[PDB]
Amino acid sequence: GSHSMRYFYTAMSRPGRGEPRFIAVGYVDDTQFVRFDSDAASPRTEPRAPWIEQEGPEYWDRNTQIFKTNTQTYRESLRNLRGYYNQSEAGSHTLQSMYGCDLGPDGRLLRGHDQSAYDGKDYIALNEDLSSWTAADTAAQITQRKWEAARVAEQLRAYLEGLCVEWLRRYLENGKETLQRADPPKTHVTHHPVSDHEATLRCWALGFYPAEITLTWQRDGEDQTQDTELVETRPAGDRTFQKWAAVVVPSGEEQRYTCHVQHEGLPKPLTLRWEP
């Protein structure tokens, strides 16, 4: 139903080891579709999903010119930010940006995003109104004044409400067989004795897409949030994701525990138990 497009840019300095590396990746939901890396033998925009391969040579050349221009802009920006923070020329620093649009189930713009971070900390972000900025500190206020003079927020608003949504809808149509297909999780409960008094019940969810899922354990109908070990959702390597939740339970009490799974690909939410 709901879809998003995002570009993720990362630039990292490496004094004594050449110019800063710039990498850009593009995603529709949890599917990467493009990559650009300034460190590649021949830097160019490359396809990463089959549905993008039909875009013409004009698309690939235009994207490459944009990413090559960003490579130079980000290199200049890393020098600027080293100055704003009175940093020495010896250390390595990172500048990251993420931007894009979110559509609701009807295909309309839900909201736009444009945020940046320096050394993994929030630096400047375009507010939800797409007309003002939130600067994290006095260094980011310098960038904010520069961007106010160049009318950046107006230009980003035009992109986010226009071209961003239009390209996202085109990608969703061209990739409809995968982008618009939710794969439900294959679920099961495994049992692993810990000792004579306890056993682990592990609830598995495998092969699902998109990554968003809810996996919870209940004991006598009450959520077990504090006692559940919930692993981070992880990629399988074939577009799908995996996750598990485990609880350590007293021996003989396994039937008081239920695993609950919520996911977009499911006809109805699941309730599972250990089936000996």
Partner: peptide, 9 residues
């Protein structure tokens, strides 16, 4: 497709 709103920080 990426934006072309490119400015130094």
């Amino acid at each position: 497709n990426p934006d072309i709103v490119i400015y130094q920080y």
